[PDB]
From a paper:
Building upon this work, we co-crystallized ShHTL7 with the triazole urea derivative KK007, after incubating them together, and soaked the obtained crystal in 1 mM Triton X-100 solution. Therefore, we attached the alkyl benzene moiety, which corresponds to the hydrophobic tail of Triton X-100 without the methyl groups, to the triazole urea scaffold, which led to the two compounds KK023-N1 and KK023-N2. Our docking model of KK023-N1 bound to ShHTL7 also suggests that the compound does not reach deep enough in the ShHTL7 binding pocket to use its potential for covalent linkage with the catalytic Ser95. Structure analysis revealed that ShHTL7 possesses a large ligand-binding pocket among other SL receptors in parasitic and nonparasitic plants. Also, the ShHTL7 binding pocket is composed of nonbulky residues, compared to OsD14 and ShHTL5, and this explained the basis for the ligand selectivity.
Striga seeds require host-derived strigolactones (SLs) for germination, and corresponding antagonists could be used as germination inhibitors. Among the several Striga SL receptors, S. hermonthica HYPO-SENSITIVE TO LIGHT (ShHTLs), ShHTL7 is the most sensitive to SLs. It is assumed to play a crucial role in regulating Striga seed germination.
Residue numbers in the entry: 3 to 270
Amino acid sequence: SIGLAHNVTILGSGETTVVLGHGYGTDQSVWKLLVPYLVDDYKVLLYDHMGAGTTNPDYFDFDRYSSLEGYSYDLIAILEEFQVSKCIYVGHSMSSMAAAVASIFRPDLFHKLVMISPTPRLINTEEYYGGFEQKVMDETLRSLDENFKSLSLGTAPLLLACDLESAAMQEYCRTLFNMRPDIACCITRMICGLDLRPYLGHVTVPCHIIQSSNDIMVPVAVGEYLRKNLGGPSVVEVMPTEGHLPHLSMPEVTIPVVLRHIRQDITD
């Protein structure tokens, strides 16, 4: 079963299903503080994307997961297996973009997308600022495999905007280093090379874009870029948070914002 392969869990009850999709380096446990505020009002489906440390390495196809589309098509299959349609999809960066692509092919499966720290592309061009320069990225990725742990540990405090000794950091590193090393490196290279800009004008489901005010992975202007380039309606809310995973590191601020966007539609 694809649901079993993705450790799908179902909780709550209701006519509307919320689907929670964790981002890079985490698993569905990242949602543990949000779930209590959903369980009374919604059915909730949680899953781990393929290659998370909780998943079977034998199911990781290095060809399919070298681009984001494979994750999009897996998500469709998960939703179909559990008879989910018109869901409220809540995702962190990588996952929210995979759902956006999925929604082009199956808009019937999505009522809206709630996106925490999304970006369609990290690498700068002459006309687009994603935060990272190609030639520096090239140097860093050349020695990624032998340096995965040291580079990840070295950058995580700025990535998360948390101290190395903090509880949020310990939680992130626990799941990050649970991935098998070759799988982690494949997913990392996939993320660093993504360019989903060609898809944006064909996304038409409503998108709720939730960003930290200071996120080393997401220049603040990327949210407005998404609003201007998505094909349907969207709302952009920059939060008084720092870090790329504000749902993990600053839940006291982030959870009420996520809940508002789950509960309140921007279309009729």
